[PDB]
Amino acid sequence: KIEEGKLVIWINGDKGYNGLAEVGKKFEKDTGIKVTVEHPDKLEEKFPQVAATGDGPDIIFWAHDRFGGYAQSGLLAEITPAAAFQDKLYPFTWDAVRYNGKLIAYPIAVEALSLIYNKDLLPNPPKTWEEIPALDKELKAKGKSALMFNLQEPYFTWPLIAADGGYAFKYAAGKYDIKDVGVDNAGAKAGLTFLVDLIKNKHMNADTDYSIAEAAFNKGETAMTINGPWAWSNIDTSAVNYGVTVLPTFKGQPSKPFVGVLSAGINAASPNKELAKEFLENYLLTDEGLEAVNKDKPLGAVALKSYEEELAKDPRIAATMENAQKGEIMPNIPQMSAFWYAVRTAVINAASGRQTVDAALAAAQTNAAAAAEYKKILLLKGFELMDDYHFTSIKSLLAYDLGLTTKMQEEYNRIKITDLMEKKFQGVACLDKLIELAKDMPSLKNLVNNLRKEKSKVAKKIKTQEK
Ligand SMILES: OC[C@H]1O[C@H](O[C@H]2[C@H](O)[C@@H](O)[C@@H](O)O[C@@H]2CO)[C@H](O)[C@@H](O)[C@@H]1O
Numbered sequence: 142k143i144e145e146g147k148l149v150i151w152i153n154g155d156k157g158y159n160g161l162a163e164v165g166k167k168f169e170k171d172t173g174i175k176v177t178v179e180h181p182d183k184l185e186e187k188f189p190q191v192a193a194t195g196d197g198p199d200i201i202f203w204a205h206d207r208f209g210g211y212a213q214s215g216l217l218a219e220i221t222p223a224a225a226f227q228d229k230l231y232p233f234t235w236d237a238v239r240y241n242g243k244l245i246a247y248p249i250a251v252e253a254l255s256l257i258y259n260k261d262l263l264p265n266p267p268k269t270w271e272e273i274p275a276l277d278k279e280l281k282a283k284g285k286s287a288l289m290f291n292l293q294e295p296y297f298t299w300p301l302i303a304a305d306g307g308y309a310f311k312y313a314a315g316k317y318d319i320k321d322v323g324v325d326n327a328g329a330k331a332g333l334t335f336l337v338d339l340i341k342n343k344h345m346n347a348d349t350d351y352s353i354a355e356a357a358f359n360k361g362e363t364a365m366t367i368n369g370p371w372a373w374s375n376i377d378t379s380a381v382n383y384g385v386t387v388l389p390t391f392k393g394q395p396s397k398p399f400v401g402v403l404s405a406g407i408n409a410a411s412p413n414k415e416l417a418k419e420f421l422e423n424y425l426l427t428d429e430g431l432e433a434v435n436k437d438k439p440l441g442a443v444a445l446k447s448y449e450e451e452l453a454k455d456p457r458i459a460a461t462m463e464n465a466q467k468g469e470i471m472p473n474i475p476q477m478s479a480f481w482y483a484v485r486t487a488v489i490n491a492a493s494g495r496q497t498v499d500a501a502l503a504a505a506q507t508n509a510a511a512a513a514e515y516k517k518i519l520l521l522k523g524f525e526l527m528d529d530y531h532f533t534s535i536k537s538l539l540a541y542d543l544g545l546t547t548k549m550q551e552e553y554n555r556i557k558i559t560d561l562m563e564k565k566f567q568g569v570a571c572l573d574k575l576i577e578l579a580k581d582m583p584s585l586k587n588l589v590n591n592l593r594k595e596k597s598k599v600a601k602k603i604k605t606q607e608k
Contacts, residue, residue, distance in 0.1 A: 142196045145412040147175045148420060151188060152202035154180040155351075155371050156403070160437030164430045168420050174413075176420065192216040195410035199417050204252065204401030205237040206481075209473035211406065212245040218407040218414050220244040226422050233470070234444035237402040240473055246404035247421045249431075250440035252369050253465035254300055254398040255457075256389065260382045262364040270301065270335060270389045270396075273365075277344040280364055289354040290367035292336075292347060292492055295484040297367055300388055300396035300468065302332040302484075309399075309480050309509075310472055319476050320606055324484060325499075325506035332391060334498050337491050347492040370439040370461055385457040388464055395467040402470070403440065476513070483509040486567065508568040511603060515571055516563050518595045523575050524555035526588045531579075532558075538578050542566075572596050 143149070148165070152158050158180050165176025179198070181187050185207050191197035193214065201211075211217050221244065227235065234248035258266040262285060267273055277287035291297045299307075306328020311321035323329065339345045358366040359379040366372075367388070376383050388396035405425070407417045424430050428448045434440060435452075442462050443449045452458045471477065487505035490496040496504070524532060536550045536558060543561045545553065553561070563571040576592050579585040 142194070143199060143408065143411055143413070147177065148200060148413055148417060149198040150176065150178045150200040150202070151184055151198040152178060152180055153184050154182070155438070156180075156202065157371070157434040157437030157440070160434040161425070163433045164424050165420070167430075168424045172416070172419075174416055189214060189216060192408055192410065197408055197410070199408055199411040199413050200421065201406045201408065202249070202403060203406075204471065205246065205248070205404045205473050206399075206401060206471035206477045207473075208238060208246050208404055208406055209240045210475040210478050212240045212243070213475045216406075216409055217245045218409050218411065220247060220407070220418075222247075222418075222422060226426075229426070229446060230444040231446060231449075234402050237470055237473065238404050246406040247426060248444040249403040249405060249426070250370075250444060251442040251462070251465060252371075252401040252403060253441070253461050253468060254297065254367050254369055254388065255385045255460050255464050256365060256387065257358065257368055257372070257376070258365045258384055258386065259358070259361060259363075260384050262361070266365065266384070266386055267389055269393075270304075270391045273389065274339070274342060274344055276364070285361075286357070286363040287344060288339075288365040288367075289345065289349055289357045289363040291349065291351040291354055292345065293350045293485075293489065295481060295488045296399065298333070298336055298488050299484075300367070300398040300464075301336060301391055302329050303397035303399075303468070304328070304391035304394045305331045307332060308469075310474070310476065312472075317472050317474050317476075319474065320510055322480070322506050322510045324480075324487070324509060325502040329502055330498055333488065333491055333502060335391065336488075337498055340492055347489075347494075370441040370457070373439045373457060374437070385460040387460060388467075396464075398464055398468040400465045400468050400470045402444070476509070479512045480509045482564070483512070483567070504568070507603065510606070511599070512563060512568055514599055514602075515568050516559050518592070518599065519562065519571050519575060520555060520559040522595050523572070523588065523592055524559060526591075527579075527585060531582060531585055534582075535575070535578055542574075569596065569600075 152161060158178050162178040165178060169175050185203050188197055188201050189211060230248055235244065238244055238246040238248050256266060267276055273287050280287050306326055308323030310317040310319060340347050354366050357363045359376055359381060361381055405421050407414055411417060426445050431440060431443050431445055431448050442458055443452060483505040487501040491498050491501040532555060536545055539545065540550060542565055566574045572592060576589055579589050
């Protein structure tokens with residue numbers, strides 16, 4: 142499926158993919174091996190879909206938080222660099238790409254969000270979130286606004302949720318406790334409430350996304366944005382005299398961004414693993430290779446010691462690391478996918494008014510901790526106890542809810558439907574839905590009765606967890 146004798150690379154559309162293609166051109170000139178760089182939409186979801194069957198790119202780039210899930214799924218080749226190469230990168234960046242004792246990617250660069258501000262509109266940026274409402278009032282009187290940033294991805298709101306105490310998974314005695322989630326504690330609620338209050342008081346708009354915020358800052362319409370180093374080169378080309386600085390404090394506490402390590406993994410199905418390693422170690426992870434990417438879109442604080450010694454003198458990188466040091470490196474555990482999905486739903490629902498802050502975060506807390514368990518019940522006590530005839534009928538009844546074509550209704554197995562069903566009906570909702578759909582099927586009445594019992598069992602187990 143994957144073509145032998147060339148390299149296909151996937152990297153996100155906000156990174157320096159034209160600079161990476163230039164590294165690939167040098168590789169081709171030395172070796173004759175052509176290197177194609179692509180930036181597919183929804184890359185972090187598309188890779189595990191195609192790689193599951195042995196398709197996809199030779200090399201996948203993403204922040205390290207997704208890579209434990211990919212490795213658990215067997216989608217990644219183990220990385221075994223010689224000690225001489227391993228010593229060229231900072232040890233903590235190798236930690237970010239180690240999963241169950243195995244290196245599963247090459248670390249490239251350390252990313253953290255900073256406060257970016259327009260020095261002509263705002264010579265002295267605010268030290269606190271709490272000052273921003275008054276600043277917005279003052280700027281609105283000049284036809285401007287104080288702050289716009291992407292409110293569709295929870296990555297950008299996390300620094301504020303985490304500031305007063307919110308967390309993802311508790312790190313306890315050397316490992317993450319996948320049952321101890323910190324998204325509905327008092328600190329998380331306080332931060333999300335402040336965000337929702339900014340929207341209620343017309344200092345931000347719930348529909349603001351990456352493109353809208355970037356355009357508004359780079360056109361000089363808003364005084365501040367929150368973004369990572371990849372954003373700097375577009376501001377450079379704009380007319381904005383900008384600075385990069387520490388994020389504002391909340392309730393006197395630093396904002397705590399999730400720190401990501403841009404990482405490159407090798408597809409377990411690649412027939413080009415030797416070439417992919419040669420490209421990543423000896424073409425990309427060099428001063429000249431990282432510079433080629435960095436001049437396109439800045440990487441942040443790179444993992445390669447020799448080149449970071451040059452970048453560290455840049456005040457923008459100093460600000461990036463100051464923010465990174467106030468935050469936490471993301472876990473790479475497989476549960477991160479469910480965490481991000483739950484938190485994305487909570488922030489969007491709270492910002493839009495669809496849910497209160499308390500209700501939105503309570504659901505995200507339960508579902509980040511318990512989605513896997515509800516899915517196990519749905520699969521093993523629901524779908525695997527019904528025959529193919531009834532499974533086909535249930536897929537037909539779910540066709541509108543899950544968007545299933547006739548071919549999808551034909552090809553999708555019980556594991557896939559379980560995944561899709563819980564994405565649509567999060568947590569306990571997926572059990573309720575199957576119970577509702579199978580209430581009236583005569584041959585499934587026994588199956589349905591036990592699902593009610595299973596639903597009750599986990600409800601008890603969920604409470605014993607919280608107290
Ligand atoms: O919003 C949740 C999202 O956050 C992170 O994605 C970041 C990425 O790390 C940055 O490099 C940049 O591209 O922005 C993304 C947010 O739009 C996580 O890495 C990702 O897994 C998670 O879904």
